[PDB]
Amino acid sequence: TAKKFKVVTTFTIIQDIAQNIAGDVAVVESITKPGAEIHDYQPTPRDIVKAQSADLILWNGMNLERWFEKFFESIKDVPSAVVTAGITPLPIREGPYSGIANPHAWMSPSNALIYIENIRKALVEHDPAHAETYNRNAQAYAEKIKALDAPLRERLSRIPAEQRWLVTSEGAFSYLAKDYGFKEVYLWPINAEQQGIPQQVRHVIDIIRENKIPVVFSESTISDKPAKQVSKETGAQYGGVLYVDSLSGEKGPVPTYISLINMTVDTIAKGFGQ
């Protein structure tokens, strides 16, 4: 074992999935730091350095990293791979990004199995000397992700189907909502310029009051103020912060992709009183 294969990912969810597949033979680092907003992130010369020293770059695609393609033009002779190939997208429903793919496909554990397969293929293609390790690690990690679905599904199934309204800030949960049968309500369809303007707040407030929805959420990379304003204006409790666009730090409460899915499902379930 000389120098380990170096993988750089755009953001932290992919970093942790890829690091599980890489195991001991590669080192995976994320360009964005935990807690940073990933859609409109502004890369720096230090990010260029990190990507250029990599052997493989991984990104989400599906319109997530608005910065990536321009950034990647600065990078020479480093292969890249988009990790969402083969996932059927859900379109964004409204706003200036309506009709394009919603990027947050990783919030469906079933989709995460496709993330794993695509990351496996890219590692095997660009570091074939370690193909057997990547293949073994990908199989073991996919087993964990597959087994994750049944307990999560059962817990959210405790919420009566007609009461399954997931009210969040960014509409980042469309894939989880599809999987587990939630109707989706959000303050803005995708992170961009307008996040919590009036008309956005008004629409959500009216939906909450009409259907007596009991809880509203924010997310870990954006402001909690619009959600808290909505809960103050309505009967709904502020259910806290869901994790979707970033892990916590390694020593924080959401250090891994598995911990992110578990934590988000648990916080939703608690907001509905289990």
Q: Which residues fall in the annotated binding site?
A: 39, 104, 170, 245
Instruction: Annotate 146-174 with b (16+ C-beta within 10 A) or e (fewer).
Output: eebbeebeebbeebeeeebbbbbbbbbbb
Question: 63 or 155: whose CB is closer to Zn ion?
Answer: 63
The Cβ of residue 202 has, within 10 Å, a number of other Cβ atoms equal to 12
Question: 80 or 191: whose CB is closer to Zn ion?
Answer: 191
Q: Report, in Å, the least distance between residue 172 CB and Zn ion.
A: 4
Q: Report, in Å, the least distance between residue 37 CB and Zn ion.
A: 8
Question: 70 or 158: whose CB is closer to Zn ion?
Answer: 70
Please give the residue ranges that form the binding site for Zn ion (CB under 5 A). 139, 170, 172, 191, 233, 245
- In the annotated binding site for Fe(2+), the residues are 39, 104, 170, 245
Furthest CA-CA distance within the chain? 63
In terms of Cα–Cα distance, which of 17, 8, 29, 56 is closest to 137?
A: 17
Question: 6 or 234: whose CB is closer to Zn ion?
Answer: 234
Q: Report, in Å, the least distance between residue 49 CB and Zn ion.
A: 24
In terms of Cα–Cα distance, which of 266, 260, 261, 267 is closest to 240?
A: 267
Sign of the C-alpha dihedral computed for residues 105, 106, 110 and 111 taken in this order: positive
Q: Report, in Å, the least distance between residue 246 CB and Zn ion.
A: 9
Question: 127 or 170: whose CB is closer to Zn ion?
Answer: 170
Q: How many helices (H) and strands (E) would you count in the chain?
A: 9, 8
Q: Report, in Å, the least distance between residue 94 CB and Zn ion.
A: 16
Residue 241 · residue 224 · CB < 8 Å:
yes
The letter for the amino acid at 220 is S
Residue 97 · residue 63 · CB < 8 Å:
yes
